[PDB]
Design a protein around this ligand. Sequence first.
Ligand SMILES: CC(=O)CC(=O)SCCNC(=O)CCNC(=O)[C@H](O)C(C)(C)COP(=O)(O)OP(=O)(O)OC[C@H]1O[C@@H](n2cnc3c(N)ncnc32)[C@H](O)[C@@H]1OP(=O)(O)O
Ligand SMILES: CC(=O)CC(=O)SCCNC(=O)CCNC(=O)[C@H](O)C(C)(C)COP(=O)(O)OP(=O)(O)OC[C@H]1O[C@@H](n2cnc3c(N)ncnc32)[C@H](O)[C@@H]1OP(=O)(O)O
Lengths: 389, 389
Amino acid sequence: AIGIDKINFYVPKYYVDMAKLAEARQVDPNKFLIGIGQTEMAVSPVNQDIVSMGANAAKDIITDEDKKKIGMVIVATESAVDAAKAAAVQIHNLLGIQPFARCFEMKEACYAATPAIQLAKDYLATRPNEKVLVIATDTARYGLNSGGEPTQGAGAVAMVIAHNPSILALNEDAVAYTEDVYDFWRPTGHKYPLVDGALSKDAYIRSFQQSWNEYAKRQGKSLADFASLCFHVPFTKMGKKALESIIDNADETTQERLRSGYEDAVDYNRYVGNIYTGSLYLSLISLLENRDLQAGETIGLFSYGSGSVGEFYSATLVEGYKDHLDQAAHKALLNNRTEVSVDAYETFFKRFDDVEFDEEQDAVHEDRHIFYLSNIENNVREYHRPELE
Amino acid sequence: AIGIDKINFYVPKYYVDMAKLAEARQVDPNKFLIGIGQTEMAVSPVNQDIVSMGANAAKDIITDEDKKKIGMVIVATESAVDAAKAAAVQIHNLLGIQPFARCFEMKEACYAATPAIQLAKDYLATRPNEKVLVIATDTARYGLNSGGEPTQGAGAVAMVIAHNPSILALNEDAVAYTEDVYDFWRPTGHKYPLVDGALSKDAYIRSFQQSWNEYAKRQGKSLADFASLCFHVPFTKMGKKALESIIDNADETTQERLRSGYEDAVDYNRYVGNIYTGSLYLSLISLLENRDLQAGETIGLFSYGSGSVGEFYSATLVEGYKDHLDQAAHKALLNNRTEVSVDAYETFFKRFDDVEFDEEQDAVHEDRHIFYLSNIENNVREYHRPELE
Ligand SMILES: CC(=O)CC(=O)SCCNC(=O)CCNC(=O)[C@H](O)C(C)(C)COP(=O)(O)OP(=O)(O)OC[C@H]1O[C@@H](n2cnc3c(N)ncnc32)[C@H](O)[C@@H]1OP(=O)(O)O
Ligand SMILES: CC(=O)CC(=O)SCCNC(=O)CCNC(=O)[C@H](O)C(C)(C)COP(=O)(O)OP(=O)(O)OC[C@H]1O[C@@H](n2cnc3c(N)ncnc32)[C@H](O)[C@@H]1OP(=O)(O)O
């Protein structure tokens, strides 16, 4: 079998409380806490870009041996910093991976990490001793006082795909569905995306229904065959709606199971926000660590990308997977963050726009053990490397 | 076997004479004609963006049946018009391909089309009744009076990867090489790339030598085993230098053959210019149509992307391939172009920057049989479809 052998995520060291944001936006806190279903929003300091967040997510899961066996490094993102040079090249360099490897970026809104791991699996079919590093990294920025502001987030998820995976085996049953729609897009030149709220909800649910129907038809499967479903989520309230529209015809035993699985799947996302390409895989991490699924059981995953493309596929938990997760490290990562006021968040937000460095405000002295953007000279980004190196 | 079943290209209807450009830039025409090795530069009218050029290259090689069997549409480019929505979705829509397919963009400077076709092959290994559509589309724009201006170009190449290919079977011998270098890049916000001419040449040649060396070592092969080599062409003279750097240690018979093959390979490129991700594949088309290679003979290909990543692989000619090429249509495509003066070229260029439509200057009435950008309303691009539809 081939699948996810290692998985880990990284989010910046700051966050803003959703109830506080609500107060500053003149709305009932519950609108955010319950309406959209978010509790804390990740805030990006200027010294963390998609390159440093991606490297930080991958550094803890690649060993010296892995550095010699990784044949491809794929970065999925819709928050690129260069129009030509793939961020995968910089991360390949920063992580010290062997030179004979392919590095490139994949793009299609928040759907990109899925074809990356699926194709990584296909690439590995004939290479039992090779591995593939896939990194989903993004900064969901809508703008201050914008309609999507409450759903903002930032982070990166790193996955090592290989034979004899310790966590999840990817099955060969994926089915995608493409339909040209303008629910969310960001033309060249625009700092923030153009959104069509109401329309983005309909497109999202339709893509899911269409992909699931085709999948169920081709595999002769039904919801009852899944221990749990894991979806892409712009915010937890949106994911709940998509689930309810599909399990509307499932048995009661199945509905209780899938509804319960969902809450475990979006646990971590409630404290980070939308991280685009990484949202589905952060939810996957949450599900695996917060729920106690049994080995051999199957999970159904739905990946979505505005524009739009949807894909439904399944994976199977591998025996002993619990021993290969980093639950303590993950809870620690989220708990070790510092809450910032809304005014502070707004200052960070404005500085990120212009990439205005400030060693004091980002408190870089505390980041000795991680990768971070230290400066830009002659249009070249310079990164600080973990002290351990 | 799996490989290229069909391949076609499209360049815009205008071009500027290199000798004319030289005179306008106050330099010896031979500097451009012999020095860099370019005769005509493709000029982009505003009604041709990467989506329409890509659709125009694929339309002539997609049959009704193909539309039903294409399960993946991959667009390689470094000239994207949206930071989130993959241009593959628009092309998928324009070409009328069946809904159950994956659509996404791949990026890594001019290297992207290669991992696209290599992964498309790995993807098809277990899907016998499916095909993949790969489209490399770009507009190489450096800026009026810039250092790279003479090497500008625009166009797209479309390839259908399938089982039992009619033209080329892709072998399982690819080896890539990555090395972080700032020879050419374009930070977000920059209209034109930042280049380091001198450095970019050495980076190119080093990547080729490192890739070739590892490939020769792994496959136990030598240049003498190739009927011809085909490489990425920023401009024909650059490819000549790279080739000369390695055939030095080759027999007289092999040097004559590879030098001769090179001239055939860059024939079409002399009249188009650099088209980034599509350059290598345009050269491949040129080689196959202008030379008379025999079935079973092997071609060695070198793909390069600044940043940088290089890959060397081989493919074998399929018996009867000549009957599956479109030399007549290609010669006609290049011949039916209209030369524009340097003044007109500069007007077209400046208009392209701001996407300022001009039905008369772009002469859209002549474009009834092709796809083209007809307008942009509310940040949404509208395209005209061939009348035959
Ligand atoms: C972006 C991607 O990554 C791609 C995708 O998945 S597309 C998914 C959707 N798109 C996005 O996420 C883009 C950004 N989204 C947006 O534009 C907006 O954030 C949004 C439209 C999703 C919501 O913004 P909004 O309009 O201000 O809130 P609104 O839609 O009015 O509704 C707020 C919710 O809180 C509820 N609510 C209102 N006041 C409340 C209160 N006091 N207490 C509790 N609930 C309350 C409302 O009933 C509503 O829930 P429903 O789903 O039952 O209607
Ligand atoms: C961009 C990608 O897609 C990635 C790659 O492949 S990177 C590899 C190539 N890089 C690029 O294309 C980047 C963009 N290009 C550039 O920066 C520039 O166009 C360039 C550096 C390639 C050349 O620009 P230039 O400086 O104006 O021309 P210059 O370097 O002076 O030399 C012109 C050539 O014509 C020759 N020449 C000069 N006058 C001549 C004359 N009257 N008659 C004939 N030959 C003449 C020169 O000797 C020279 O040839 P060689 O050096 O190879 O012997």
